[PDB]
Swiss-Prot record, chain A:
Belongs to the G-protein coupled receptor 3 family. GABA-B receptor subfamily. Heterodimer of GABBR1 and GABBR2. Homodimers may form, but are inactive. Isoform 1E (without C-terminal intracellular domain) is unable to dimerize via a coiled-coil interaction with GABBR2. Interacts (via C-terminus) with ATF4 (via leucine zipper domain). Interacts with JAKMIP1. It comes from Homo sapiens (Human). Glycans are attached at N244, N275, N317, N329, N341. This is Gamma-aminobutyric acid type B receptor subunit 1. Its main location: membrane. It is linked to Neurodevelopmental disorder with language delay and variable cognitive abnormalities: An autosomal dominant disorder characterized by language delay ranging from mild to severe, varying degrees of intellectual disability, and learning difficulties. Additional features include early motor delay, muscular hypotonia, behavioral abnormalities, sleep disorders, and seizures. One of its GO terms (biological process) is synaptic transmission, GABAergic. The gene is GABBR1. 4-aminobutanoate binds at S82, S105, H122, Y202, E301. The chain holds residues 166 to 864 of 961 of the full protein. Disulfide bonds join C55-C81, C211-C245. It comes from the Eukaryota.
UniProtKB/Swiss-Prot annotation, chain B:
Belongs to the G-protein coupled receptor 3 family. GABA-B receptor subfamily. Component of a heterodimeric G-protein coupled receptor for GABA, formed by GABBR1 and GABBR2. Within the heterodimeric GABA receptor, only GABBR1 seems to bind agonists, while GABBR2 mediates coupling to G proteins. Ligand binding causes a conformation change that triggers signaling via guanine nucleotide-binding proteins (G proteins) and modulates the activity of down-stream effectors, such as adenylate cyclase. This is Gamma-aminobutyric acid type B receptor subunit 2. Residues 436-453, 504-521, 595-610 are cytoplasmic. Changing G612W: In DEE59; uncertain significance. Alpha-helical parts of the C-terminal intracellular region mediate heterodimeric interaction with GABBR1. One of its GO terms (molecular function) is G protein-coupled GABA receptor activity. GO terms for biological process: adenylate cyclase-inhibiting G protein-coupled receptor signaling pathway; chemical synaptic transmission; G protein-coupled receptor signaling pathway; gamma-aminobutyric acid signaling pathway; negative regulation of adenylate cyclase activity; neuron-glial cell signaling; synaptic transmission, GABAergic. The gene is GABBR2.
Amino acid sequence: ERRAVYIGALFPMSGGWPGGQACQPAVEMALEDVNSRRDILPDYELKLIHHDSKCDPGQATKYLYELLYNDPIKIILMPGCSSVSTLVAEAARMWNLIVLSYGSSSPALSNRQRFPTFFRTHPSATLHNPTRVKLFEKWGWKKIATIQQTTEVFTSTLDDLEERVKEAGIEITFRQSFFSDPAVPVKNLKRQDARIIVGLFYETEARKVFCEVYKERLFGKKYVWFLIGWYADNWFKIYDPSINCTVDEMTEAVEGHITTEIVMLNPANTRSISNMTSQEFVEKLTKRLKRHPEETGGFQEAPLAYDAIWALALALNKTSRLEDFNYNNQTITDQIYRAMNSSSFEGVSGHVVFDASGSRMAWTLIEQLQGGSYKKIGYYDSTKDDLSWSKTDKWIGGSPPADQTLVIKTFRFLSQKLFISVSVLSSLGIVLAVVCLSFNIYNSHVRYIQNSQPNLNNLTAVGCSLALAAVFPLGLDGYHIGRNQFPFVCQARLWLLGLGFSLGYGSMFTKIWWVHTVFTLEPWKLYATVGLLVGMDVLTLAIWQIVDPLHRTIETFAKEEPDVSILPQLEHCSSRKMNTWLGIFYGYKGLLLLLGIFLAYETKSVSTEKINDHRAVGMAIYNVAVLCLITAPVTMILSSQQDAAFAFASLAIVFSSYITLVVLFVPKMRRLITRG
Amino acid sequence: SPPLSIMGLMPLTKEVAKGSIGRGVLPAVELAIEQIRNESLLRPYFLDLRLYDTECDNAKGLKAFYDAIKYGPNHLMVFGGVCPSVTSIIAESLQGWNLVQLSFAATTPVLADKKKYPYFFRTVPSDNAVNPAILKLLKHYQWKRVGTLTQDVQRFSEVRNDLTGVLYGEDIEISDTESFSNDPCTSVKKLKGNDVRIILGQFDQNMAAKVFCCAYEENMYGSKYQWIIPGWYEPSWWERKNLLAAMEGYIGVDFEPLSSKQIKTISGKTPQQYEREYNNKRSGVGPSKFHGYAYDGIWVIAKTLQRAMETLHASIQDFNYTDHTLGRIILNAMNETNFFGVTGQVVFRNGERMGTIKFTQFQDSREVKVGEYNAVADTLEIINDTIRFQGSEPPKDKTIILEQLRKISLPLYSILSALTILGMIMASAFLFFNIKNRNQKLIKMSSPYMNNLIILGGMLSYASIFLFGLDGSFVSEKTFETLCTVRTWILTVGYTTAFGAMFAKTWRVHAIFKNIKDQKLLVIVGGMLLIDLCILICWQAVDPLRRTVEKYSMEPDISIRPLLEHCENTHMTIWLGIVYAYKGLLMLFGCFLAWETRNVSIPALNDSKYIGMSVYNVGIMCIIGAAVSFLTRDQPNVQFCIVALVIIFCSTITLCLVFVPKLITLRTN
Ligand SMILES: *[C@@H]1O[C@H](CO)[C@@H](O)[C@H](O[C@@H]2O[C@H](CO)[C@@H](O)[C@H](O)[C@H]2NC(C)=O)[C@H]1NC(C)=O
Ligand SMILES: *[C@@H]1O[C@H](CO)[C@@H](O[C@@H]2O[C@H](CO)[C@@H](O)[C@H](O)[C@H]2NC(C)=O)[C@H](O)[C@H]1NC(C)=O
Ligand SMILES: C[C@H](NC[C@H](O)CP(=O)(O)Cc1ccccc1)c1ccc(Cl)c(Cl)c1
Ligand SMILES: *[C@@H]1O[C@H](CO)[C@@H](O)[C@H](O)[C@H]1NC(C)=O
Ligand SMILES: *[C@@H]1O[C@H](CO)[C@@H](O)[C@H](O)[C@H]1NC(C)=O
Ligand SMILES: [Mg+2]
């Protein structure tokens, strides 16, 4: 005779998950197979008492009373669902019992302060997230978005995902919930232009949200959808009278969407403890059903009912002592806890080992949709950071997109050919200036030249030469300069132009001034008049450079297109509040430049000694004023452009210089050469 | 006699913190049972209540229920259940044993789901009965806008999600909604920014102090803010000064433990007698605010048990739990009960009770009751001379907007319009004096008509000042839109003619000094006038200036936002710049000639020096006027007066310096 040992179980057969249609025969077969062999339990037989629960906690407590207060005496309790396991695990503490569930996948049952005697085989739903993040890392993504139907499982899952992703240098953006209105939450995605998406929900939520998607055009080449895998293939080719979209309209919205999954059957064909192969087990239990294994329920979960009742026997063999078990003593249960806590073996589902919180770890699987059919991509074992790719992925753009459109900044420059000729003409100008200065300084003892002021003419030539030179640093930017030697150019421009202009106009004006004055001429007085104007100009320039220096100022205008956006940036050597300085320096000069013209139009015919060239000076002053007046406003209004603001300011200086130096110096040669 | 048994579930130990609720109500049950026995209402049978502890623990609760089902006698009903974790477990497992339950201390809304809990009745109202009272407190006082603060827990969300559902038919509209978990001050700031004065709070004891402190720090309190929050806290929870100043003026809501009305109830007593009986029955056991509901529960259970025993005789000692008919009988019997009790009249609208809510207000020391709202009648009752406000009117959820124009005040407009007549009379006098001596030699030497033109220009300019002032509700809105054009035309012509003449004369002088007469001057003046005439025609024909309104200020009890009007057009910078530049250049040119010809001159023209001085004065006057115009456009009153003074001096000193010598020379000779 063998001393019996009873256990109690609750199997569902209707509701939201009928997983007892196919999990009762498996456990019966396991029991008979383990009782046959005489190497595990020689003098201890096993037997089972089962009840129905319908996966609701209303019947479960009634049956738990019917099963816990009437003889015989039970040892181990096995609940199926996740809504009637919580209850029994909370309650059994007062009866000193063990519970071993084969179908509950809720992250809340992983605590150890409320559930201290709970073990299970079906892993949790916090086992996709490591895969998800280890896959994000592989493809360089740092901005994610998510949405979730309302339920506890999905909420806890997303919380764990956030905790795991906020610890590897990644950030989340958006979290939108709903119950049955997927219209506004999916419409509010385009408002933020989110592209990488993870979706947690059931099948009907899918068949609805995806029609909403197709309407809102949220798919293409820059959109990736992450989903869950236990949906049944062909879940988009099924009639939906509550849906307006069609089959071909939606089959184009669910193209190329990843999906994870958990694996329960050993993909290999290796033998196990019971000397059985997966193929010798599927058919073996399919020969024991009424309907077909595709129309019944809870078929893919039986291996976890088989591979559980074996752990029990394995851990109970060691202890070997059981005919006297009262619900009060708490030492036998502790022994069994220590035995089950040290489990390691191979079964139809693989290597089963229980972690600290009762749950077990397993390998997970990845897939992808390629033309109305799923095609595997790889596995993953979260225990040894392992992986096994296949090189079978696919993309529309030969590569996967990234989180957001990168913006590249471009720089505009001159033509690089309009500068060379204009910088060359300056050399000819300076050559003419030197030639003329030499021709005027060679002869220095003739009365013809002693009459007309030689020093003033030379000063004018020097001023014009400096002005011509100042043209170089005006075009030098970019290709021929960096971010360090930039300020050295602006100072050059300013200190050359603002010096040469005044150093020429001083003479070219003071001569006519003193002439018209005597017309109403000691040489000493004339020098003071010229020196005064230049002395004043330097004061304004130095006070500007002292209390207001110019360093740089970028200008960011419209961003032109080419998934890359280019925004072009300009580079103005400017300062703060330059408008006032420019207005001041332009008006203070326009005054003189508009007065000298009238003074010259006055003394048109007056004749004097040592004032012979007055007409030539008048013509020179006439040209200069018009050119300067026209050029200054145009240049000020064209600060945006880069080519125009160079022509209208480089031609108007060479023209003036040339027409000036070939007017009051040509007749001298034309005469002194023809008259020896 | 044959007993009738009843099951009881409530905490009894002292380690649990809720044991007080199971110890402060037993006296009432003892009284009720004593009375039921004395009165002899169940002739053969009597009651027998049984006590069982749970410790408010899920496991410790099931074991007691089970032990009772096994050892104890054949029970017929369940009575009690204060903690929501274990009663929500027990309420789903009754259709199998065919029992009925009656809770008097569970205030959770979930138990209203009659799909899972069909055999559950209670008396104490739920926490989702406060909103139909808040509604009729808002309506009475004519309020429309609201600000709701939610805490991130399901206890409070269960009612935050029920509030938004009853306001559908009504007109109230939710303006804002802020949620918080630990940091409420960010939400308090986000609310204060929206400028709301109505707050509907839902939070526990400490977060109340937190939010009050951060609101005081945000200055979200005063005679323009109202507080609404729960009122089931404990006294002295504040256990500084500033806090008490931000708290006063808040309204709390709870349920009425014991009615004040005096009427004969079903036990032959009155709420004021039972209060004394109870307060004298318990000596050491502390007070609990739920006894009025236990007392009524006992009586309702007795009444329904009797009404059911009646129908049974027309067809009770051996009731195995497999009796479906008896359970249905009792259930259908309990749905037909209505009487009067210490708490009010008891009725059951699908389990939930229809009871009385009560408001309360805090006045510098504690909360005092105000109004009682009776659900079964939908009538709200208030007491006067006890409620108070910070102001003398019911605050509203908005701010008043005022639009002052800033127009002139007219203490000085009349003065200036009067002073403007001195110039006109002087000009008329001078014109007549010049017209009288049109034959003498003095008048014949100097220019004949240039002076006349100058005087006409002065008078025309004088009109411009009259035109400047009309604005700010002086004339019809359709007039202001037609005066700017005539104003600018008149002022343009007035400045044109006079200076044209004053410049042509100096031109003739300077020309004679270097090397008909009266005709060429007129011709050049006409040309100068033609330029401005063409310019003005072009402008008045292309895009006239329209009246634009500007609003810029915040002066706070209604807020006032002032408004002003500007006669401008979009493209004003180019027009103004061109006109100003053209007039300035001419003035400078004219001024230079006068200085050059200070001493030199030509005979037959004696007014050279004086005209030069006039030119200088006019130039400086116009420059100052133009500068002042751009600087004081915001302030409209000072600009007007200063510009008027400038115009007067400019156009008067000229004449006073030209004609005066030619007049005293005749007066003396
Ligand atoms: C339960 O009691 C309530 C309160 O009187 C009652 O509303 C339920 O049905 C009332 O039943 C009447 C017929 O007996 C019916 O005419 C009446 O319309 C109905 N009440 C309402 C609001 O419609 C009662 N239900 C039962 C006794 O099963
Ligand atoms: C496990 O099963 C295998 C095959 O199912 C057994 O090896 C077979 O064992 C039988 C023993 O009766 C031999 O007659 C066959 O020759 C074997 N077949 C092959 C292909 O090797 C093995 O003995 C079993 N192990 C046990 C029962 O411990
Ligand atoms: C793999 C997973 N295992 C099932 C859990 O074991 C049941 P659960 O209680 O944990 C959550 C639950 C799920 C559905 C309906 C009610 C409840 C699963 C999930 C859904 C389906 Cl459709 C299938 Cl085939 C398989
Ligand atoms: C069961 O226990 C016995 C004795 O400890 C041992 O010999 C046997 O190998 C065990 N069975 C298994 C399957 O480990
Ligand atoms: C058994 O579980 C305890 C905690 O429950 C743990 O400390 C111990 O390491 C486990 N035993 C083994 C062999 O892992
Ligand atoms: Mg699949």
